[PDB]
Amino acid sequence: QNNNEFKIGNRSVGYNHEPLIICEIGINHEGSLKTAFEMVDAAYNAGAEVVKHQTHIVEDEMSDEAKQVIPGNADVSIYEIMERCALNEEDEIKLKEYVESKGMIFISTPFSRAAALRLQRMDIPAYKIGSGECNNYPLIKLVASFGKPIILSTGMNSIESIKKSVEIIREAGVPYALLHCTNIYPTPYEDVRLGGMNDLSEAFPDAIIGLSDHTLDNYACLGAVALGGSILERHFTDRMDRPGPDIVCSMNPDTFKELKQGAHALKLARGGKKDTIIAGEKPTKDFAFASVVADKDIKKGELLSGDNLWVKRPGNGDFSVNEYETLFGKVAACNIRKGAQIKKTDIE
Amino acid sequence: QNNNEFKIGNRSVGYNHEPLIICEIGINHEGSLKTAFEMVDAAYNAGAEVVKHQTHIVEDEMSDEAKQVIPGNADVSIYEIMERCALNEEDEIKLKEYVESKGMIFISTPFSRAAALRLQRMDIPAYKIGSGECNNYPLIKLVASFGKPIILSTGMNSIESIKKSVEIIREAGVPYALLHCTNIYPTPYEDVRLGGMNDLSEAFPDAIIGLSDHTLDNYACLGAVALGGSILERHFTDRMDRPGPDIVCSMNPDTFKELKQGAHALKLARGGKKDTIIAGEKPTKDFAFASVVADKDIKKGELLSGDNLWVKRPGNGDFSVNEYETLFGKVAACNIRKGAQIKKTDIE
Ligand SMILES: CC(O)N[C@H](CO)[C@@H](O)[C@H](O)[C@H](O)CO
Ligand SMILES: CC(O)N[C@H](CO)[C@@H](O)[C@H](O)[C@H](O)CO
Ligand SMILES: [Mn+2]
Ligand SMILES: [Mn+2]
C-alpha cells in the first residue's frame, strides 16, 4: 500500500515492517507498582516488544468538573478513578527503568501539559496521544515540539477534526502514525469499522496506519493487519481475574502470543498482486491445465472442428485449451486417433 | 464495498451476507464412502453449511499423458491418485443424498464434460470450477449454459486470462463468484497475496469475491473476511491423522468452528466509515474531551491570552478546546479564578 516508516528507538515501524503490538497496561495496575511489575513481567515473558503506560496527573489533566462525571465503563467519577490508579513521578520513572531492564521499549500517553513535560524529562522514544486528546490541538502542538515521532489514536474524531492535528504534526517535522479506534470499553464488533483505516490512509498518505482496539478478542486486530495495519494496541494484563475498568477488553500472555503469531502470518499474507506469478504453482499448472485432444477418430484430409476436438489434462500437449478454437477448420495431415492430444504434425 | 449477491439454494451469498464457508472433502475420502460419510458427519456436527466434493471421471478429464505426470504434493501420477480416490456415479449420488440428509448443501467440482453432465443430472444448486479449469473456456461455456450460479476459483490465472471466462459467464446470464487462490499444497503465507481479492473486485465489479485456501491454518481466510470476502473454501477432514495429499492443509471440526466464529466477528467488524458517529462513545467524549479553563487568576478588564488560558477535561465547559484560540484578545467581564472553566459570562 505504502512505504511510509519511522523508528521508535531501534524498532522500525511501517507497512513493510513486522507489525508492532503495543501492550498497554495503562491503569491496569490500579496504582500498585507491584502489580505493574507483575504485568511487565508477563509482557516480557509473552514476548512483548513495547509496554505503554498512561501518565496521569489529576490536577493538571482535569478541572473540578471531572469530579462529577462518570465514564461509560465505571460507576464513580473519572477523577476518583484516576486519583486511584495514578502513579506519581518517581514511581513511573522506576516503571520505565524496569520495562527497559526487561529489554523492552517504554512509551506512555500524556493527558496533560505537566505529563508531557514529565515524559520529555524521561526522554521516551515516541509519544502516544489518546483518542480523547486527538482534538486537543494545544496539547498536540506541545508534544510535537518535542521532536519525537507521534502515535495518534483517532477515536471519537472525524477526518476533518484529525486534519488539524496532522497539520500541526507535519509543521513540527516529526513522523507519525494514525491509529483508527473506537472508545467504548468494551467495544462490540459492529462498531469497529475496519474500513476506517483506509479512510485514514487515503486522507493522510504520509501516515503510518494502525489500530487501537477495545473489543474482547484479537479478531479486530488480526483484521487490521490484513488491511495493512503496522501498529496494534490492546490493553494488557497478567491475568483476566484482575479488577479494573479496562481489564475486560485487555489481552493476556496467551492471547498476546496469539495476536503476535497471527500478525506475523498476516504480514506475510497481505497485499501483493493477483497477476504475480508464483513458481511453486508450476507443477500444479503442468498437470491441471488442459490440452487439445481428438474427440473422435479423424481421417486424413478431414477438417478439425468443435465436434471432433475437445480438451483434457495434462497441459503438455502441442495445443493448449486456450488455442482450442484456432484449430477449427484445419486439415488433418494424417489419421488422428480418438483421445490423442492434437500435435503440430497432425494438421497441414 | 459492494452489494452484489446471488443464492446457492436458499443460502444468500455476498458482502452484505454472512460469509459462507465451503467444507471441501474433495478427495480426502480416498475413494471410501465410509470415510466420506464420517467426514460429512464431522462437518455436520461442526456446524457446516456446505460440503463440496470433487467429481472425477479419469478417462474424460485426462488423456494417457496424465499417467506420466506427478502433482507437487505427491509421488505418483495424478492419474493413479484420481483412479484411487474417484467415486463412481452411484456412490456420489448417495454422497449428495447423505449430505442433504444432514441438512447441508451439496455442490461439487467437475473436471470434465462428463462430470459436468453428471452433476447437471443431479441438479446441484451451484457449480464450482477449480483453478485448474479457470482457463478451460470450452468447459466453462458448458457449465454456464446449465443456468446455475458459478463459483470460480482463479488460482494460477491472470486477470486477463480470467476476463475470458467471466465474459462467457455473463453471456450465459448466471450470477458468479471469484475466489482468489494459490494452488500449492500446502501454500506458504508469503504466496497468499490477499491484495489479489481487491484486484479481482476492481476488475470485475459484478462479481462476488471470496478466497479458496491451502495454507496450514485460518489466518488467510480470516484476513480475506476482513478484506470483504463473502465465500471461504478450505479442504476439510474429520481428523488430521488421515492419509491423503490434501489432508495437511485441511481444516478439521475444531478449526472449522474457529474459522466460522472468526468469520462472523469479522463480518461485523469490517468495512464502515471513519466519520460514522458511534452513540456508545458519547459518555467517553463527555469526560475525555477538554474545555478551556483559566491558567491563572485573571482580573476584570484584563485580556485573555494563550498565556493565561489553557485546556482540561471534562468537555462540559462553555468553550471547547476547539475554540481555545478564539478567546485570545477577549476581555474578562469579571475576575476569573485560576483553574476554573471559562464561561460565556466571563468575557465581554
Ligand atoms: C479516553 C481515554 O483516556 N481512554 C483511556 C485509554 O483507552 C482509558 O484507559 C480510560 O482512562 C479508562 O477507560 C477510564 O475508565
Ligand atoms: C488443481 C486441482 O484440481 N486441485 C484440487 C483441488 O484443490 C486438488 O484436490 C488436487 O486434485 C490434488 O491436490 C491432487 O493431488
Ligand atoms: Mn485504549
Ligand atoms: Mn482447493
Q: Where are the alpha helices (DSSP H) in B136-281?
A: 137-144, 159-172, 189-192, 196-203, 219-227, 253-269
- As a whole number of angstroms, the distance between CA A35 and CA A243 comes to 11
We report the CATH number of the domain holding residue A340 as 3.90.1210.10
Q: Helix A253-269 crosses helix A219-227 at what angle (to 10 degrees)? A: 20
Its sign, for the CA torsion A101, A107, A111, A113, is positive
Closest CA to A108 of A146, A69, A164: A146
With cell 476547539, the residue in question is B322
Is the CB of B191 less than 8 angstroms away from the CB of A271?
no
Residues 242-301 of B with CB under 8 A from A: 262, 265-266, 268-276, 278, 280-291, 293
- As a whole number of angstroms, the distance between CA B192 and CA B232 comes to 14
- As a whole number of angstroms, the distance between CA A205 and CA B302 comes to 44
Burial (Cβ within 10 Å: 0-12, 13-18, ≥19) of residue B264: middle
- As a whole number of angstroms, the distance between CA A66 and CA A78 comes to 6
A109 in the same domain as A14: yes
Check if the beta carbon of residue B275 is closer than 8 Å to that of residue A158.
yes
Burial (Cβ within 10 Å: 0-12, 13-18, ≥19) of residue B35: middle
Residues 21-40 of A with CB under 8 A from B: none
B174 in the same domain as B72: yes
> Last residue of a domain, which of B225, B254, B275?
B275
B240 in the same domain as B127: yes
Is the CB of A65 less than 8 angstroms away from the CB of B316?
yes
Check if the beta carbon of residue A4 is closer than 8 Å to that of residue A15.
yes
Helix, strand or coil, per DSSP, at residue A298: strand
Q: How far is CA B67 from CA A314, B76, B133, in A?
A: 9, 9, 19
B264 in the same domain as B195: yes
The per-residue b/e assignment along B100-129, b for 16 or more CB within 10 angstroms, e otherwise, is eeeebbbbbbbbbbebbbbbbeeebebbbb
B225 in the same domain as B137: yes
- As a whole number of angstroms, the distance between CA A306 and CA A317 comes to 17
Closest chain A residue to the Cα of B154, Cα to Cα? A274
Instruction: Tell me the β-bridge partners of A298.
Output: A336
For B72, which of A60, A284, A314 is closest by C-beta distance? A284
Residues with Cβ within 8 Å of B166's Cβ and at least 6 positions away in sequence, in order, are B152, B176, B178, B204, B207
Gap from A202 CA to chain B (nearest CA, Å): 11
Burial (Cβ within 10 Å: 0-12, 13-18, ≥19) of residue B130: buried
Closest chain B residue to the Cα of A131, Cα to Cα? B288
A302 in the same domain as A214: no
- As a whole number of angstroms, the distance between CA B157 and CA B138 comes to 16
- As a whole number of angstroms, the distance between CA A214 and CA A233 comes to 9
Residues closing a segment before a gap in chain A (C–N exceeding 2.5 Å): none
Closest CA to B157 of A312, A315, A227, A225: A315
We report the CATH number of the domain holding residue B258 as 3.20.20.70
Say how many CB pairs under 8 Å bridge A and B.
Answer: 306
- As a whole number of angstroms, the distance between CA B116 and CA A311 comes to 14
A320 in the same domain as A280: yes
With cell 508469503, the residue in question is B190
Peptide bond into B314 cis (omega under 30): yes
> Last residue of a domain, which of A218, A243, A275?
A275
B324 in the same domain as B244: no
Residues 98-157 of A with CB under 8 A from B: 111-113, 130-133, 135-139, 154-156
State the distance from the centre of ligand 1 to the C-alpha of B283, rounded, in angstroms.
11
- The residue segments making up the domain with residue A82 are 5-275
How many structural domains are present in chain B? 2
> Last residue of a domain, which of B275, B308, B339?
B275
Is the CB of A223 less than 8 angstroms away from the CB of B219?
no
B202 in the same domain as B339: no
Peptide bond into A243 cis (omega under 30): no
State the distance from the centre of ligand 1 to the C-alpha of A238, rounded, in angstroms.
19
Contact residues, chain A, for B219 at CB < 8 Å: 222, 262, 265-266, 269
The ligand 2 atom nearest the CA atom of B246: 13
The DSSP result for B79-107, as a single string, is: HHHHHHH---HHHHHHHHHHHHHTT-EEE
Residue B262 near ligand 2, beta carbon < 6 Å: no
Q: According to the annotation, is B185 in a ligand binding site?
A: yes
Q: How far is CA B14 from CA A198, B8, B106, B208, B233, in A?
A: 21, 11, 19, 6, 15
A326 in the same domain as A243: no
Residues with Cβ within 8 Å of B309's Cβ and at least 6 positions away in sequence, in order, are B292, B293, B294, B295, B324, B327, B328, B342
Is the CB of B136 less than 8 angstroms away from the CB of A220?
no
Gap from A156 CA to chain B (nearest CA, Å): 7
Which residue is closest in CA terms to ligand 1's atom 8?
A246
Check if the beta carbon of residue B325 is closer than 8 Å to that of residue A49.
no
Burial (Cβ within 10 Å: 0-12, 13-18, ≥19) of residue A171: exposed
DSSP H or E run through B58: helix B58-61
Conformational region of residue B277, where left means phi above 0, alpha means psi within -120 to 50, and beta covers everything else = beta
DSSP H or E run through A139: helix A137-144
B300 in the same domain as B268: no
The C-alpha angle B253, A213, B18, rounded to 5 degrees, equals 40
Give the ligand with the smallest distance to the CA of B214: 4
Contact residues, chain A, for B290 at CB < 8 Å: 133, 136, 139
Residue B186 near ligand 2, beta carbon < 6 Å: no
Q: Which amino acid is at B203?
A: A
Q: According to the annotation, is B183 in a ligand binding site?
A: yes
Residue A245 near ligand 1, beta carbon < 6 Å: yes
Check if the beta carbon of residue B250 is closer than 8 Å to that of residue A204.
no
State the distance from the centre of ligand 1 to the C-alpha of A13, rounded, in angstroms.
25
Phi, psi of A332 (to 5 degrees): -65, 120
For B293, which of A63, A274, A287 is closest by C-beta distance? A63
Is the CB of B71 less than 8 angstroms away from the CB of A287?
yes
Is the CB of B313 less than 8 angstroms away from the CB of A61?
yes
Is the CB of B195 less than 8 angstroms away from the CB of A138?
no
Its sign, for the CA torsion A92, A95, A99, A101, is positive
Count of other CB atoms within 10 angstroms of residue A136: 26
Is the CB of A132 less than 8 angstroms away from the CB of B289?
yes
Q: According to the annotation, is A214 in a ligand binding site?
A: yes
Check if the beta carbon of residue B329 is closer than 8 Å to that of residue B302.
no
Cell numbers at B110, concatenated: 467437475
Closest CA to A178 of A157, B20, A186, A189: A157
Cell numbers at B234, concatenated: 478450505
Count of other CB atoms within 10 angstroms of residue A345: 9
B346 in the same domain as B284: yes
Q: Testing the interface with B: which of A284, A321, A343 to mutate, by most B Cβ within 10 A?
A: A284
- Strands A291-294 and B105-110, how do they pair? unpaired
Residues with Cβ within 8 Å of B326's Cβ and at least 6 positions away in sequence, in order, are none
Helix, strand or coil, per DSSP, at residue A49: coil
- As a whole number of angstroms, the distance between CA A216 and CA A73 comes to 14
Helix, strand or coil, per DSSP, at residue B293: strand
DSSP H or E run through A169: helix A159-172
Count of other CB atoms within 10 angstroms of residue A122: 15
Which of A58, A73, A214, A246 to probe ligand 1 with, by most ligand atoms within 8 A of CB?
A: A246
Check if the beta carbon of residue A299 is closer than 8 Å to that of residue A332.
yes
Gap from B34 CA to chain A (nearest CA, Å): 28
